[PDB]
Amino acid sequence: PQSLNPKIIIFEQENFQGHSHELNGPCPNLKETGVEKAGSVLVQAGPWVGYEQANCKGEQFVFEKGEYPRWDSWTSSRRTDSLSSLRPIKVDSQEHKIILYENPNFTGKKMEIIDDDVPSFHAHGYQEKVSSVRVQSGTWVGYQYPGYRGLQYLLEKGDYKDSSDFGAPHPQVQSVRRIRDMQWHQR
Amino acid sequence: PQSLNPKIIIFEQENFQGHSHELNGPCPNLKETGVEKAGSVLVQAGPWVGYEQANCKGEQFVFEKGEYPRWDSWTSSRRTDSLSSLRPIKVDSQEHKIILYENPNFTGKKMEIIDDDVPSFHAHGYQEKVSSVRVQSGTWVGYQYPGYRGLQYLLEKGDYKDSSDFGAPHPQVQSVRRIRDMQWHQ
Amino acid sequence: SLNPKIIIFEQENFQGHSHELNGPCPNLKETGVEKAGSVLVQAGPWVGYEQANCKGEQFVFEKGEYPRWDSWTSSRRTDSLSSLRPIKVDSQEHKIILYENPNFTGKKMEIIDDDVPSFHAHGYQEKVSSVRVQSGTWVGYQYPGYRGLQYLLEKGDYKDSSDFGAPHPQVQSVRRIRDMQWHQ
Amino acid sequence: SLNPKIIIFEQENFQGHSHELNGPCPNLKETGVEKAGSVLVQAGPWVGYEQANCKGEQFVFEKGEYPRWDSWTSSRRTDSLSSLRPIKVDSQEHKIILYENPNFTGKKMEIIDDDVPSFHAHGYQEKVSSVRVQSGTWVGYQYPGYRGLQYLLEKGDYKDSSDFGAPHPQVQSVRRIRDMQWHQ
Numbered sequence: 215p216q217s218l219n220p221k222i223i224i225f226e227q228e229n230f231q232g233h234s235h236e237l238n239g240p241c242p243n244l245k246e247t248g249v250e251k252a253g254s255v256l257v258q259a260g261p262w263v264g265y266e267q268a269n270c271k272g273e274q275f276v277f278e279k280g281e282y283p284r285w286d287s288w289t290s291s292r293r294t295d296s297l298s299s300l301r302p303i304k305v306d307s308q309e310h311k312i313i314l315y316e317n318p319n320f321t322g323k324k325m326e327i328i329d330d331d332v333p334s335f336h337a338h339g340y341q342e343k344v345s346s347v348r349v350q351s352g353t354w355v356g357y358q359y360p361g362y363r364g365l366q367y368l369l370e371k372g373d374y375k376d377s378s379d380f381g382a383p384h385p386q387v388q389s390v391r392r393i394r395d396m397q398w399h400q401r
Numbered sequence: 402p403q404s405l406n407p408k409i410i411i412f413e414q415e416n417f418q419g420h421s422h423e424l425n426g427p428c429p430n431l432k433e434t435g436v437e438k439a440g441s442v443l444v445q446a447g448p449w450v451g452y453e454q455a456n457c458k459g460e461q462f463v464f465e466k467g468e469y470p471r472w473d474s475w476t477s478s479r480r481t482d483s484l485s486s487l488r489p490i491k492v493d494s495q496e497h498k499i500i501l502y503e504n505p506n507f508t509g510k511k512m513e514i515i516d517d518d519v520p521s522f523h524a525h526g527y528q529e530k531v532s533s534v535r536v537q538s539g540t541w542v543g544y545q546y547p548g549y550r551g552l553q554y555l556l557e558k559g560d561y562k563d564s565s566d567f568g569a570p571h572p573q574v575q576s577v578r579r580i581r582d583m584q585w586h587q
Numbered sequence: 588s589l590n591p592k593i594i595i596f597e598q599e600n601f602q603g604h605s606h607e608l609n610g611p612c613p614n615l616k617e618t619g620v621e622k623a624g625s626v627l628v629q630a631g632p633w634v635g636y637e638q639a640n641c642k643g644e645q646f647v648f649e650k651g652e653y654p655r656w657d658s659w660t661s662s663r664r665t666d667s668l669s670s671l672r673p674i675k676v677d678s679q680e681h682k683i684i685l686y687e688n689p690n691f692t693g694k695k696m697e698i699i700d701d702d703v704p705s706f707h708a709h710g711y712q713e714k715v716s717s718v719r720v721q722s723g724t725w726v727g728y729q730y731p732g733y734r735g736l737q738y739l740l741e742k743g744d745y746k747d748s749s750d751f752g753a754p755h756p757q758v759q760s761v762r763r764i765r766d767m768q769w770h771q
Numbered sequence: 772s773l774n775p776k777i778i779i780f781e782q783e784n785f786q787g788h789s790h791e792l793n794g795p796c797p798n799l800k801e802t803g804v805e806k807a808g809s810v811l812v813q814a815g816p817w818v819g820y821e822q823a824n825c826k827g828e829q830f831v832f833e834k835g836e837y838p839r840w841d842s843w844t845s846s847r848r849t850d851s852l853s854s855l856r857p858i859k860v861d862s863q864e865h866k867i868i869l870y871e872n873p874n875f876t877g878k879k880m881e882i883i884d885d886d887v888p889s890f891h892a893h894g895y896q897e898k899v900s901s902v903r904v905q906s907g908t909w910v911g912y913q914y915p916g917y918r919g920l921q922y923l924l925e926k927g928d929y930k931d932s933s934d935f936g937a938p939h940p941q942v943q944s945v946r947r948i949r950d951m952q953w954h955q
Contacts, residue, residue, distance in 0.1 A: 217586050218586055219585055220585040272568070274552075274554060276542050279889045280890065290552065303540065303555070303580065305582070306497070306557070307582075308538055333833055337766050337835075353491075353494070355463050361832075362733045363843065388836065393492050394492075394494060396447075396448070444707075464732075466708040469730060474730045522651070523649075524950055524952070542916075548648075549916065589953060591952075630952035646921060661920065675954075676948045677906055723862070764833075766862070767860040768814040768834060769773050
């Protein structure tokens with residue numbers, strides 16, 4: 215699997231100086247938990263939203279992975295230099311993803327494809343066989359040879375534990391394209 | 402017009418001659434149709450996937466809107482010219498959509514945004530105040546000024562029937578950008 | 588109007604005496620607006636600088652309203668706006684235009700950047716008798732989903748479907764060749 | 772300069788005496804392979820033709836394995852492959868390259884067409900000392916989320932952070948300017 219946690223470090227002074235407080239979840243008053251004023255901020259896993267006042271109140275500031283070495287780096291209109299609450303953001307991402315694997319059962323070298331078509335696997339990382347596919351979203355056709363030639367393999371949302379599962383007489387797939395358009399409305 | 406059902410016609414002979422059969426839903430046997438051997442195919446609403454053997458098993462051919470005048474046109478790797486079952490493909494495609502409204506409670510002029518950041522609402526014609534916002538999907542950041550300058554309003558899925566709802570002192574939003582990435586999991 | 592247009596005001600919220608520029612201004616003292624209070628951009632984008640002759644802190648203005656000096660300085664190192672100019676944006680496409688009748692007559696399809704697996708799905712069910720590739724490298728195919736005969740279509744003009752190697756004038760799909768692993 | 776290379780083999784599945792090609796060959800008779808059974812492309816793409824001197828049915832080969840005659844021709848009334856040439860592809864894409872050290876040296880970052888709100892999120896936590904803008908109009912920013920000092924980056928070279936107006940060599944986000952409203 216993967217369970218990476220949100221990870222923001224708020225320092226006491228500007229330029230990553232003084233006492234560091236690592237936070238991994240929502241914090242409705244940062245004064246109460248130790249750090250009373252936050253001088254810099256380092257996001258290692260976000261994004262995060264800061265707010266002006268405790269209890270997710272007032273001016274919002276959005277933190278993404280990177281260094282925020284002063285107060286003014288996160289806040290234009292400076293009602294305050296302060297930062298009272300924080301919470302991780304939890305994004306909605308409807309990006310069409312397919313992930314193709316070297317070995318059966320979702321093992322070995324992989325290639326993730328997001329939204330785009332791929333007329334040549336060799337022109338990416340991948341010169342290996344393709345033995346399993348996870349379609350996390352979208353509708354794809356895989357093909358044996360590059361530029362969408364040879365046998366067609368329709369890949370729709372689901373797991374494909376072995377190459378036979380998606381119709382392959384052997385585990386060879388060198389190009390993929392996404393099916394984007396339907397000419398009729400569904401339920 | 403605009404179709405409410407897939408539309409594929411299969412012909413007995415090549416170049417769209419002979420007895421046609423119009424399918425508008427799955428067919429696990431194409432012998433039933435009286436078009437036992439399809440010689441051509443015309444997709445009017447698709448896409449469709451045909452199969453080599455009945456009940457959707459064997460070699461696959463994805464047919465998209467257009468003319469397929471001969472058996473060869475759809476099976477490059479000509480192990481067979483058989484075509485024994487056809488079914489519509491149920492195409493999964495999600496978007497990320499936000500809609501921002503001139504006047505409170507989801508009324509007045511409205512600007513839809515899909516997937517893309519928008520650094521100038523003025524450049525999308527929209528010069529009006531933004532009083533209410535409906536976020537369908539995706540995670541957005543509205544700004545007061547163009548080029549993602551000024552006060553930030555995080556706009557997540559659901560409804561904001563006034564501008565005070567998304568933390569605005571006045572109903573002014575002039576740029577919006579999607580947040581695409583996360584580095585953490587539930 | 589084919590005109591870059593930025594109006595600076597002397598005061599905030601678009602009050603006081605306006606000076607409307609329609610081209611570069613390397614010193615804003617030779618306007619009637621010593622320091623700019625607010626800015627409005629009707630055609631852009633523009634870039635301002637903190638000191639004269641496009642020197643110092645840079646601020647990029649896009650079409651819209653900037654009702655205060657701090658609405659455009661992320662850094663308040665300065666409020667000063669001492670030079671402006673329009674930004675001529677470099678924006679390139681790949682364009683191919685296919686045509687129903689020979690010699691670039693009849694109903695036409697303009698493709699830009701994107702592959703097009705079904706010509707019928709775009710509203711074009713006509714024959715393709717001539718092609719004019721303006722930029723990019725494309726492959727047209729007889730049938731949808733890049734099926735059938737291939738015709739490499741490169742920059743330049745194809746007055747008859749025989750000039751791109753078609754036996755009859757049928758194309759129902761195009762893709763762009765995007766990547767090259769060699770260089771000269 | 773990387774160099775175009777395709778290998779044609781005398782039999783299927785990359786068996787038999789192989790031949791490397793590195794430029795236009797108008798007749799594979801002067802190939803000790805008088806017919807090819809398979810084809811591997813390492814640097815492409817290549818367009819091949821049914822007859823000598825680049826005539827008849829066209830076939831576009833991209834990087835990868837083509838283990839039989841039928842892997843590259845859809846409608847066969849010929850299995851022959853009698854001429855090859857590289858394709859010079861025209862990719863008018865918007866590209867910017869940001870380097871760790873001055874004069875275009877150290878760990879680098881290429882951005883094509885798309886904006887980048889967080890450099891850290893692309894695994895670039897290094898300083899940015901020099902910048903090469905091949906095509907497009909870009910604004911670089913000190914902080915993530917198009918915040919801090921703005922640096923307008925247009926077509927050309929920046930051998931040092933000082934050149935694009937940076938007091939210190941920190942860039943943590945880029946966006947591309949796409950739209951203009953003047954001289955169309």
